[PDB]
């Protein structure tokens, strides 16, 4: 022990607890902004994926590489991550779930190509040894589709030059203000698994001039809209995970303060009794 050094640790742990409470303030306010942005993005992206779901199934079928269920030689992943710490295990759990699926393909001899949207992903997969084919980092408090397009444009080129056969986005879902889960979502090869449009089977879809250029443009927009929503939702998940972590760090700091104080009080009492005993013995 030691009265001054313990009192110094008590001072430092006190101020750290006060900071983690303020960080919990910044994390909640940013969660408010991030989730209302998500709430705005959700209708447009949800209806765009519905639109393509109608195009999935119904006649007057033109034939297009993103539409058919071709065979899998290699698989693409778009991976979103944070660039920051103090978000608990959100990135670790997502990276582990991806590593499990990539292992399952590597059992099949199917290679994985990875595009990273955050610095934590770049660091982890480069140092683990996933083939990072694209990467952007440090998007900012307000992320914008424009910067995110380039990595996607690379993954699109890898698919449309025919190398890359299946493509996924992996991201965390903002299931609730206090509950989220990592998900791997099938992305560009339009799953015929989706419901047949039997409910309006009167319609066989028909086209304005050049269905190829129009449909190509529309699918470009679909893929991008899916990536933009998946990023905005992962940022809302990040702010929720940070606020939960800072709340835990605040309670653990209080728990240390209440125990260091007991060490300090016992030490001051012993110091006060070692002296006095020695002054009375010396007074003799």
């Amino acid at each position: 022990a030691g009265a001054k050094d313990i009192r110094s640790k008590i001072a430092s742990v006190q101020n750290t607890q006060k900071i983690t409470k303020a960080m919990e303030m910044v994390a909640a306010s940013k969660m408010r902004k991030s989730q209302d942005r998500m709430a705005a993005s959700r209708p447009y992206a949800e209806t765009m994926r519905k639109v393509i779901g109608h195009l999935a199934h119904g006649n007057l079928e033109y034939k297009h590489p993103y539409l058919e269920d071709r065979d899998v030689k290699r698989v693409g992943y778009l991976v979103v991550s944070t660039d920051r710490g103090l978000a608990g295990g959100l990135n670790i759990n997502l990276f582990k779930k991806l590593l499990a699926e990539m292992k399952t393909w590597t059992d099949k001899g199917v290679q994985a190509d990875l595009a990273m949207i955050g610095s934590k992903g770049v660091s982890f997969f480069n140092s683990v040894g996933g083939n990072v084919v694209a990467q952007v980092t440090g998007m900012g408090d307000n992320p914008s589709l424009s910067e995110l397009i380039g990595p996607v444009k690379v993954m699109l080129q890898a698919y449309d030059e025919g190398r890359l056969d299946k493509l996924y986005i992996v991201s965390n879902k903002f299931i609730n203000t206090m509950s989220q889960v990592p998900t791997i979502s099938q992305l560009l090869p339009l799953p015929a698994s989706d419901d047949d449009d039997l409910k309006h089977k009167s319609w066989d879809y028909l086209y304005e001039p050049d269905p190829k250029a129009l449909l190509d443009t529309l699918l470009r927009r679909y893929v991008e809209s899916q990536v933009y929503q998946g990023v905005v939702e992962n940022l809302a998940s990040e702010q929720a995970a940070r606020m939960v972590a800072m709340k835990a760090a605040t309670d653990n700091g209080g728990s240390l303060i209440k125990e260091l104080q007991l060490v300090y009080n016992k030490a001051r009492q012993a110091s006060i009794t070692q002296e006095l005993t020695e002054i009375v013995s010396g007074a003799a």
């Binding site: 742990v13 750290t16 710490g85 103090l86 608990g88 295990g89 670790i92 972590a245 835990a248 760090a249 653990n252 700091g253 240390l256």
Partner: protein
């Protein structure tokens, strides 16, 4: 000392001390932040150090009354084989509670089977 006790024993005992010391250093970081902010190597040593602490325990014949577990006598060759195996991560795939209150390493594998 390796001149009296041998090099394999000496190296095992120093390996154990080096791991458990590093775990002590990590405990103060974990206490405020939790385990999530650790490096992945640091998480690996935290897992092995917890398994080593569990594996140090043993069920004595003279303690059979307080607990009920049958006692165990462990030979030196068994114990250095067990700690050498954990230190180099041969047993990284087993849960921690498998190592608690067992004798030789083999026994821990059996315990792990029944969880």
């Amino acid at each position: 000392d390796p001149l009296v006790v041998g090099q394999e024993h000496y190296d095992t005992a120093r390996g154990v001390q080096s791991i458990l010391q590093r775990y002590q250093e990590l405990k103060d970081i974990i206490a405020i932040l939790g385990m999530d902010e650790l490096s992945e190597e640091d998480k690996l040593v935290v897992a092995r150090a917890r398994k080593i602490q569990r594996f140090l325990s043993q069920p004595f014949f003279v303690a059979e009354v307080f607990t009920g577990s049958p006692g165990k006598y462990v030979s030196l060759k068994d114990t250095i084989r067990g700690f050498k195996g954990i230190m180099e991560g041969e047993y990284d795939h087993l849960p921690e509670q498998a190592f608690y209150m067992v004798g030789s390493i083999e026994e821990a594998v059996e315990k792990a089977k029944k969880l």
